[PDB]
Amino acid sequence: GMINEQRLLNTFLELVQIDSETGNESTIQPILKEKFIALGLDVKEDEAAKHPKLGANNLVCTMNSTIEVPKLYLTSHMDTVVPAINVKPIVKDDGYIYSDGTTILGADDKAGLAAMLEVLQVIKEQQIPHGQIQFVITVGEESGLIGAKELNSELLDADFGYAIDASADVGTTVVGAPTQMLISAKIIGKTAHASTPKEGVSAINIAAKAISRMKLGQVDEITTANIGKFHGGSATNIVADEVILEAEARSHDPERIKTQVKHMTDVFETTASELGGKAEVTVEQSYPGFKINDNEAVVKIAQESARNLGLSANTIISGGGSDGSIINTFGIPSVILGVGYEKIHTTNERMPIKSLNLLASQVLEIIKIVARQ
């Protein structure tokens, strides 16, 4: 075929053996920079390292057009979740790459990086004509898309592109994603001895009553909410005067997320006030939602590339975020390609070899389709 399977596997295995836990990207980043320079790209850094939760700058690597056709970008993230120091990957007879059980594999997202490096090597050695391609390697994706948020957008020059970073089968494309917001609550009551409970106001009882009347779980077909953490109270014989709650909400409609966050806020505040306490609520947007139209070129090209390789060509809506959630806010239409990694963020993480081969073949195919528009 086109891609070198043996080389792609070796690249992937090399990459997972470079320690890059999120916020500690300073080892992997110079190595990736030098690899993309070695492949003939002009590699530029932004100033993301200045952020105190990030260990190196983002990389924006540009390959000149050798044809005019559309300007493409591709993105993967160089960081992994914890624990991912000294990953010892094992290729098995079942056709899956595993960790040894002591770490994550870091297929999320070094499969995406291995796929990008293999494709450039294939393009070089076969002189495949192509348009302009940007390879955007981010830091801190696993700390809440922080590299993407600190990205110098003037370094980008693209009509559309692809985040190689969806939890879906290879050939499935994520065409929309939700807005996510964090909602935290501090519920204050009044301390008393537990024998004289009329002298106090229990923040545990207020928080429990609030939660019991709150729209939570699958709030509707396109909206979710979850209380992740509930902590409060020091002793059985004391009326609890403080509870801390940490929650989230997600929706694919911006008006529904607004209503849901206001709802949670108001339920906490008015339940606490009714029972003689008070609620301090604070909110933070993690990322904004998007939906790319089904007839946009970026979608149809993704689908054609899947069809050409005998894959589903399905388009789905994700339950969460990626760097494409942020890059979409720059006005560059972006969809998220299935990588086919499994059990990510756990020490059982694994990568099917056939999926790595197809992903690499798909990214090549996308570049060729864009090159013939």
List residues near its own copies by CB under 8 A: 178, 182, 193-198, 202, 204-205, 207-212, 216-218, 224-240, 243, 246-248, 250, 319-320
| E strands, the chain, in order | 42-45, 59-63, 72-77, 90-91, 96-98, 133-138, 160-166, 173-177, 179-188, 217-220, 223-232, 242-251, 278-287, 290-291, 315-317, 334-338, 350-352
State the Cα–Cα distance between residues 170 and 338, nearest whole angstrom: 5
Short-list 128, 157, 135, CA closest to 37? 135
- Residue with the shortest CB distance to Zn ion: 109
Q: How far is the CB of 165 from its own copies (least distance, A)?
A: 16
Quick check: is 125 catalytic? no
Q: Are 360 and 119 in contact (CB under 8 A)?
A: yes
Q: Is 315 in the site for Ca ion (CB under 5 A)?
A: yes
Q: Which residues sit opposite 227 in a β-bridge?
A: 247
Q: In what order do the strands lie in the sheet with 90-91?
A: 90-91, 96-98, 350-352
Q: Is 323 in the site for Zn ion (CB under 5 A)?
A: no
Q: How far is the CB of 196 from its own copies (least distance, A)?
A: 6
Q: Is 165 in the site for Zn ion (CB under 5 A)?
A: yes
Q: How far is the CB of 267 from its own copies (least distance, A)?
A: 12
> Using the rule CB under 5 A, which residue among 25, 79, 108, 150 binds Ca ion?
108
Quick check: is 94 catalytic? no
Closer residue to Ca ion, CB minimum distance, 49 or 84: 49
Find where tokens 């993967």 sit.
Answer: 76
State the Cα–Cα distance between residues 300 and 306, nearest whole angstrom: 10
Mention every residue, 6+ apart, whose C-beta is less than 8 A from residue 35.
Answer: 117
Determine the interface stretch with Ca ion among 45-53, 200-208, 242-250, 270-278 (rule: CB under 5 A).
Answer: 45-53
State the Cα–Cα distance between residues 345 and 21, nearest whole angstrom: 11
The entry of Ca ion, its own copies, Zn ion, none that residue 315 binds, CB within 5 to 8 Å by partner kind: Ca ion
Q: Are 128 and 2 in contact (CB under 8 A)?
A: no
Options 118, 141, 323, 365, the catalytic residue? 141
The entry of its own copies, Zn ion, Ca ion, none that residue 165 binds, CB within 5 to 8 Å by partner kind: Zn ion
The entry of Zn ion, Ca ion, its own copies, none that residue 71 binds, CB within 5 to 8 Å by partner kind: none
Q: How far is the CB of 143 from its own copies (least distance, A)?
A: 13
Closer residue to its own copies, CB minimum distance, 158 or 219: 219
Q: Are 211 and 309 in contact (CB under 8 A)?
A: no
Options 79, 165, 241, 365, the catalytic residue? 79
Of residues 207 through 246, those in contact with Ca ion by CB under 5 A are none
Closer residue to Ca ion, CB minimum distance, 157 or 294: 294
Q: Which residues sit opposite 217 in a β-bridge?
A: 225
Q: How far is the CB of 319 from its own copies (least distance, A)?
A: 3
State the Cα–Cα distance between residues 74 and 164, nearest whole angstrom: 7
Q: Is 76 in the site for Ca ion (CB under 5 A)?
A: no
Q: How far is the CB of 365 from its own copies (least distance, A)?
A: 30
Catalytic residues: 79, 141
- Residue ranges binding Zn ion (CB under 5 A): 108-109, 165
Binding region for Ca ion (CB under 5 A): 49, 54, 108, 315
